[PDB]
Structure formats: C-alpha cells, structure tokens
Write a protein that binds this ligand. Structure first.
Ligand code: CDL
Ligand code: PC1
Ligand code: PC1
Ligand code: PC1
Ligand code: CXT
Ligand code: LDM
Ligand code: LDM
Length: 292
C-alpha cells in the first residue's frame, strides 16, 4: 500500500513509455508528414515526400538528423497527466458502464459497456492532454530548416502561438473525430482479439513469439480500421492558425468530404503503413526495454 511503491511504479511506467515512443519517433514523424503534408503551408505539392524512404533520406539533410524527434517532447510528457487522470476516472467508468453485467450471459451489453468505458476514459483524459497531441502533430509537420524558418520552435511556443490566434478551440481541433476513433479502435481491437483467441490459440501454450506476433497483429488491424478517423483528426489539427479563405476544412464532415473528393478514398490511409511499423517497433522496444 506504500505510497512510495505506487510512485515508483508510476514513474517506471512513465520511463518505459518515454523510451519506446522516443525510440519510434522518427518513423512516427514520417507517418505524420505523409498523413498531413497535403494540409501543410510550407510543403508545395512539388516538394511533398514521395514516401517513407524518400522521407527518411530527406529530413536529415533538409532539417537535421535531430529533427526526426521534432515534437517528441509531448510524447514523453503525456503519460503522466494521462495516467494521473485514469487513476481517478478509469475504474469508475468501468463500474458505471459494466457494474452488474454478466460477461458470459450478456455478451453485447458487456461489449457496449466496454466501448463506452474506454470511450469515456479516453475523452476525459483528452480533455486535458489533447493540446499535447495537437502540438506533437503541428511540430512534427513543421519542416522549417532552421529557427528562422520554423513554424513553431517548440512545445510551449506551438501551444501559446496557436492559443493567441485561435484561443482554446485551436488547441482542440479534431477532438470529436478522435473520440469516435477511440471507440472504433477499441471495437476493432476487442472484436478481432476475441475472434482470434477462439481460432488458433487454445489456452495459450504456444511460444512467446507467436503469442507476441498475434498481439501485434491485433494492434495493427485495429489501427488500420480506425486510421481514416486519425487522418481527418490530424488534418483538422492542421487548420489551427489559419484564417479566412485559408481554411481548408470548415468542419469534420467537410474534412471527410474534401479528402475524399480532392485526394481520393485511398488518401485516408496516407502514412498508414508507416503507422503499422511505428506500432510494431514501439512494442518491440518495450520488450527490449523490460529485458534490461
Ligand atoms: C534531455 C534530452 C534532450 O536532449 O532534450 C533536448 C530538447 C531540445 O530540443 P528543442 O527543439 O530545442 O526543444 C524545444 C521543445 O522543448 C521540445 O520540442 P520538440 O518536442 O519538438 O522536441 C523534442 C525533442 C525533445 O525530446 C525529448 O526531450 C525526449 C527525451 C526525454 C527527456 C526526458 C526529460 C524529463 C524531464 C525531467 C525533469 C522534470 C522534473 C519535474 O527531441 C530532441 O531534441 C531529440 C532527443 C534525442 C532522442 C535520441 C534518443 O529539450 C527538451 O525538449 C527538454 C524539455 C525538458 C522537460
Ligand atoms: C540523437 C542525438 O542526440 O544525436 C544528435 C547528432 C547530431 O544531430 P544534428 O546533426 O541535428 O546536430 C545537433 C547540433 N547541436 C547539438 C549543436 C544543436 O546525431 C549524430 O551524431 C548521428 C548519430 C546517431 C546515432 C546515435 C549515437
Ligand atoms: C450498421 C449499423 C450497426 C449498428 C452498430 C451501432 C453502434 C453501437 C455499437 C455498440 C454496441 C451496442 C450494443 C447494444 C447493447 C444494448 C444492450 C442490449 O439490450 O443488447 C441486446 C442484444 C443482446 O444483448 P446481450 O448479448 O447482452 O444479451 C441479453 C441477455 N439475454 C439474451 C438473456 C436477454 O444486443 C443486440 O442484438 C444489439 C447488438 C448490436 C451490435
Ligand atoms: C515540464 C515541461 C516543461 C516544457 O515542456 O518545457 C517548456 C519550455 C520549452 O519552451 P519551447 O518549447 O519554446 O522551447 C525552447 C525554444 N527553443 C527551441 C528556442 C529552444 O522549457 C524551457 O525553455 C526552459 C525549461 C527547461 C526545464 C528544465
Ligand atoms: C482516430 C484515432 C485513431 C484510433 C484511436 C486513437 C488511439 C489508437 C487510442 C489509444 O489507446 C487507448 O486504447 C487502449 C486499447 O484499447 C487503452 O488501453 S486499455 O484501457 O488498457 O484497454 C488505452 O487506455 S489507457 O487506459 O491506457 O489510457 C487507451 O488510451 C487512451 O484513452 C489514451 C488518451 C491519451 C486518449 C491511445 C493512442 C495509441 O496510439 O495507442 C495513443 O495516443 O497513445 C491513440 C492514437 C490516436 C488515435 C488513432 C486517434 O487519433
Ligand atoms: C476485422 C476486420 C473487419 C474489416 C475492416 C475493414 C476496414 C476498412 C477501413 C474502413 C475505414 C472506416 O472505418 N471508415 C468509416 C467511414 C465513416 N464516415 C462515413 C462517417 O466517415
Ligand atoms: C479495401 C479498400 C479499403 C479502403 C477503404 C477506404 C475508406 C475511405 C473512406 O472511409 N472514405 C469515406 C468518404 C466520405 N464520403 C462518403 C462522405 O464521401
């Protein structure tokens, strides 16, 4: 019950999360650039990154090797407020949406309860940490080659600059679709894993390896299914700071339509492969980390 033990666990978790996310930040930046460069003010269509390889080879000489971690501070910080918030809300939402439900005799009522609980805890946390996700994205998208060409010079600068021009709404652009995404993601994750645990994995006796790959596969699939929601989310974040006729999307719905009509249905998955890689590498660093 030691408050000390709890603090130690809390910090250790924050350290682990900070290491894995920092580790895959380069590939995450590529994912973000490909996903949002269409809505960038600095990237002309001619200078757009042609892909992962074209992207990884260009940013070092274009903006400096260190720029691979541009916007990563938000990544190492988010964990703390996020987990602090879960400590006060997470279990309460579970009790609220799942209390009294028999998991075995009421599959769907349980399923829905699970989604509402995850969705409620996620939206609640985001009410506080979303600006961090916002800045992580806007900084990642910034391709300035030096302090003078930087659209934002850092986490604090991004948040303050946007706040001054758009107020709070600017820092929360894309909030709603992100929550929809959280629910779709959770629905796909549990839906797949559920169907999975049935076929091929009897009382999990298989090697740790296959047991890991399977967990990664469920994550990748859940990430793909909800990816479109992530793309309009980030594209909306790119609107903050813009004014008048400069605004590409007037709302989430307008965003969905615009992307579909101006870029094509496949465009919703720009960066999706990079995202799959990012997720895998992230999980691989944690195991690599826990073993040291
Ligand atoms: C120490 C790590 C370091 O070199 O940080 C430099 C970094 C300098 O880069 P910058 O672009 O000038 O910073 C502007 C923004 O602060 C941050 O702007 P940003 O989010 O765009 O930049 C993220 C930045 C920063 O990336 C990190 O800071 C990730 C590393 C984890 C640091 C953990 C700090 C924990 C702070 C504890 C003290 C708090 C007490 C309470 O990434 C890097 O510069 C590369 C890090 C190297 C990774 C290689 C592995 O400074 C910080 O971000 C430190 C914040 C301290 C809190
Ligand atoms: C990452 C890191 O800290 O390396 C920065 C350096 C240089 O990044 P840089 O080229 O952007 O220079 C930063 C220059 N200062 C610090 C003055 C702002 O990366 C390397 O030397 C390449 C080796 C990476 C392998 C890690 C060892
Ligand atoms: C194309 C449109 C798709 C519609 C999906 C709508 C999105 C919402 C997804 C969240 C899942 C909602 C589940 C409904 C839960 C309501 C509880 C209920 O009364 O379910 C009754 C039923 C069964 O709930 P059950 O499985 O808990 O069983 C009740 C227990 N007995 C049978 C003993 C009474 O749920 C459905 O048929 C609706 C599920 C849709 C998925
Ligand atoms: C704790 C979180 C503090 C944080 O995010 O740093 C804010 C600010 C970051 O502001 P920033 O995001 O504008 O970055 C500094 C600006 N350039 C790029 C020119 C270096 O931290 C500091 O500037 C000094 C505090 C160091 C903490 C020890
Ligand atoms: C439209 C979308 C896409 C689909 C939904 C989300 C996540 C995948 C959704 C996700 O992560 C969520 O899903 C997990 C799996 O079901 C769930 O774990 S569980 O409780 O153990 O089941 C996490 O819960 S928490 O308890 O740890 O807090 C939950 O985190 C949140 O609620 C984090 C808030 C900051 C939002 C977190 C996250 C991640 O990459 O994994 C993260 O930022 O770290 C999001 C990335 C952004 C999108 C991508 C959003 O743009
Ligand atoms: C277990 C595998 C199931 C197969 C899943 C196949 C996913 C293909 C990705 C679909 C992307 C998606 O969700 N778009 C929802 C559009 C919703 N609106 C119209 C409101 O914008
Ligand atoms: C197999 C193929 C998997 C790719 C599925 C692509 C999904 C892209 C998507 O959701 N587009 C929604 C367009 C929005 N509206 C309807 C309003 O125009």
């Amino acid at each position: 019950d030691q408050a000390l033990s709890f603090l130690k666990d809390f910090l250790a978790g924050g350290v682990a999360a900070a290491i894995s996310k920092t580790a895959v930040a380069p590939i995450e930046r590529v994912k973000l650039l490909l996903q949002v460069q269409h809505a960038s003010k600095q990237i002309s269509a001619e200078k757009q990154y042609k892909g992962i390889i074209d992207c990884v080879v260009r940013i070092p000489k274009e903006q400096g090797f260190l720029s691979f971690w541009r916007g990563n501070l938000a990544n190492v910080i988010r964990y703390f407020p996020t987990q602090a918030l879960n400590f006060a809300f997470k279990d309460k939402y579970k009790q609220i949406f799942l209390g009294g439900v028999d998991r075995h005799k009421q599959f769907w009522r349980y399923f829905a309860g699970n989604l509402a609980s995850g969705g409620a805890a996620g939206a609640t946390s985001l009410c506080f940490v979303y600006p961090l996700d916002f800045a992580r994205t806007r900084l990642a998208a910034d391709v300035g080659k030096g302090a003078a060409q930087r659209e934002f010079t850092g986490l604090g600068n991004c948040i303050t600059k946007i706040f001054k021009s758009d107020g709070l709404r600017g820092l929360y652009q894309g909030f709603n679709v992100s929550v929809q995404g959280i629910i779709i993601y959770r629905a796909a994750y549990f839906g797949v894993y559920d169907t999975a645990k049935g076929m091929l994995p009897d009382p999990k006796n298989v090697h740790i390896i296959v047991s890991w790959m399977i967990a990664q596969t469920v994550t990748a699939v859940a990430g793909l299914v909800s990816y479109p929601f992530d793309t309009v989310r980030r594209r909306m974040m790119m609107q903050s700071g813009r004014k008048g006729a400069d605004i590409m999307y007037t709302g989430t719905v307008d965003c969905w339509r615009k992307i579909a009509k101006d870029e094509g249905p496949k465009a919703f998955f720009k960066g999706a492969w990079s995202n799959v890689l990012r997720g895998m590498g992230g999980a691989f660093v944690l195991v690599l980390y826990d073993e040291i």
